[PDB]
Amino acid sequence: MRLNTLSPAEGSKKAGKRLGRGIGSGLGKTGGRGHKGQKSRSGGGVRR
Amino acid sequence: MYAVFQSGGKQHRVSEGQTVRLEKLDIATGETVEFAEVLMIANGEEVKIGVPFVDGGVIKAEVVAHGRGEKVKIVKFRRRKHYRKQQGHRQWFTDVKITGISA
Amino acid sequence: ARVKRGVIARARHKKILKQAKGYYGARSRVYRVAFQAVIKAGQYAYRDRRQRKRQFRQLWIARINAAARQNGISYSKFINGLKKASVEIDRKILADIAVFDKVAFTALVEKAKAALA
Amino acid sequence: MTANSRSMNLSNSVAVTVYEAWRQLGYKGSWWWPRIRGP
Amino acid sequence: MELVLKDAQSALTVSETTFGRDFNEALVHQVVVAYAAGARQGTRAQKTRAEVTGSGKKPWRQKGTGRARSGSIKSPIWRSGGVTFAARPQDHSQKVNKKMYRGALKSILSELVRQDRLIVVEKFSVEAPKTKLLAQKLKDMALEDVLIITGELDENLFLAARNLHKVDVRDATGIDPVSLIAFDKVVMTADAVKQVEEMLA
RNA sequence: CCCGGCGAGGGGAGUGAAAAAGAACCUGAAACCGUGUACGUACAAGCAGUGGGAGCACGCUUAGGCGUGUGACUGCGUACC
Numbered sequence: 209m210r211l212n213t214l215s216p217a218e219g220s221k222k223a224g225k226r227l228g229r230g231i232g233s234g235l236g237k238t239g240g241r242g243h244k245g246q247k248s249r250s251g252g253g254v255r256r
Numbered sequence: 257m258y259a260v261f262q263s264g265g266k267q268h269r270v271s272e273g274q275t276v277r278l279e280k281l282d283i284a285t286g287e288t289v290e291f292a293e294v295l296m297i298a299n300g301e302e303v304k305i306g307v308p309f310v311d312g313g314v315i316k317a318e319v320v321a322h323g324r325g326e327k328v329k330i331v332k333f334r335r336r337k338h339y340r341k342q343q344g345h346r347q348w349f350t351d352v353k354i355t356g357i358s359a
Numbered sequence: 360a361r362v363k364r365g366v367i368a369r370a371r372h373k374k375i376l377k378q379a380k381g382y383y384g385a386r387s388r389v390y391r392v393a394f395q396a397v398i399k400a401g402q403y404a405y406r407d408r409r410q411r412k413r414q415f416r417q418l419w420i421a422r423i424n425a426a427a428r429q430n431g432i433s434y435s436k437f438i439n440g441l442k443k444a445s446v447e448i449d450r451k452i453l454a455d456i457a458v459f460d461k462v463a464f465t466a467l468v469e470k471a472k473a474a475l476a
Numbered sequence: 477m478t479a480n481s482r483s484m485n486l487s488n489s490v491a492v493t494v495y496e497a498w499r500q501l502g503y504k505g506s507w508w509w510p511r512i513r514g515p
Numbered sequence: 516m517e518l519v520l521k522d523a524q525s526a527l528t529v530s531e532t533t534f535g536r537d538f539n540e541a542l543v544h545q546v547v548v549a550y551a552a553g554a555r556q557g558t559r560a561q562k563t564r565a566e567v568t569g570s571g572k573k574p575w576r577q578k579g580t581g582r583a584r585s586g587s588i589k590s591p592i593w594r595s596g597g598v599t600f601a602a603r604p605q606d607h608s609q610k611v612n613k614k615m616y617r618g619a620l621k622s623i624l625s626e627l628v629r630q631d632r633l634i635v636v637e638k639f640s641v642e643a644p645k646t647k648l649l650a651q652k653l654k655d656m657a658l659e660d661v662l663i664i665t666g667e668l669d670e671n672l673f674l675a676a677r678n679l680h681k682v683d684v685r686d687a688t689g690i691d692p693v694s695l696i697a698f699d700k701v702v703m704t705a706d707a708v709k710q711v712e713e714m715l716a
Numbered sequence: 717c718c719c720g721g722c723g724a725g726g727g728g729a730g731u732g733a734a735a736a737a738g739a740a741c742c743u744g745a746a747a748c749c750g751u752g753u754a755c756g757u758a759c760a761a762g763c764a765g766u767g768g769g770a771g772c773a774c775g776c777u778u779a780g781g782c783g784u785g786u787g788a789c790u791g792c793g794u795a796c797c
Contacts, residue, residue, distance in 0.1 A: 214544040298460065302462060308447070333401070
């Protein structure tokens, strides 16, 4: 009815994760990767 | 001439014409309050040490104002553990003016 | 969609330094030191909010004990006698009475001494 | 037309001169004295 | 339902299911957002670490000196280096199902009817391509910003309205969900109404 | 026009809405370095703060005391990643 009055359906838009931004976010400083090891490296991992 | 009464959690010593800050009370800011319980009234012949309170003592006071106290800050920190948080706080109070101390 | 960080960072830095006025030396001029100083001050204030309630009680006990022996009785016996007589007077009030009204304190002491009997 | 111009001019050349003065091959280490906790 | 005329005091009958629906705001919002994203033109770029003019020589050796380890003049953390995740030209268009594109139009038309923002007449034209005549005619009906829809596009009408900022004209085929929301009043000829009704099925 | 080496740099006069827009010339932050005012400091031991707390100076005020700055003395207390 007006271009600045429409709204999305509730619960259809989730925020999304952002790693490595501070302490309060709960995802800074290793962003959920744990401590040292192969799986915590840029490009690390094993085959299928 | 002074008396001792037990307000909302603590005790105070007060005389006529004083202003006393208390905890929050659910009373409009124009009317009087009664403090039926008293602990001691003293003037020269100070012998009114009522054991569980006194017999005929009451205190007449009327509510002056309501408001919130001054903001304090809470900080929690744990060194080299990746943990901290902050929080504020302000406290409600209530002012009364003593108008009558009666034995 | 490039975003510059000048205004926001300057405001955030200025917020902290305004909380460190009066501190000695570099602890009120450079951010890296003022930050740690402010955090320490917060921790100390939180801890001291508890200790304040102990020092005053300690002081009240000392003053009551000093005033009670003027009338020939110890602190512990005085306090015990008050309880056997069913007297509920706060220690803060007792210290205030001891300082500012000797006669009322003497009346209290005599009542407690009689209560012990 | 000399004073401020050339006076400030030399401060540009000094930067590049100090920049080049760091060839760093002449570092000459090996700290010729015997090793600190040798074999 | 019965659609009242404007200048002939007659009535028009149209499909209830096409002009008397309820308002599904979530569907309309998704469709209008998708339409807005289709108008983008993603033409931008930056330079990665591998695309900066320079050389591959090491700045200085690995050990020995007192400096930190470096291996490239074009590292992303150096001044005049590369952007860590540079951007390429993109394409932001989305997909909308045919069926859920028409439902939005039906809902919008129903809402316009409910809000009395839709005006229906039978004939609308000007004799000569002059802007002043069109402005006078619009002022007669007390209209300031509108979307004129006609069964066939008259060149005279189209030319007369080009310089007017608040006024646009279209055809039955060339309507879009955004244009229906932007303006306050919409006027359609009866033949345009029938064409739209049969088009939306 | 004046001081100065027929200097460099200044103080007047004048233009301009503005010269604290004067050619190092829009705005002009921080580190860093100074002049002035108020309080403290030459018998005192340590992450320099925090909780109490006299005295002094300034402002308001009708008492009664408030607000700002400083801070003698005292309890507790070994930075951050």
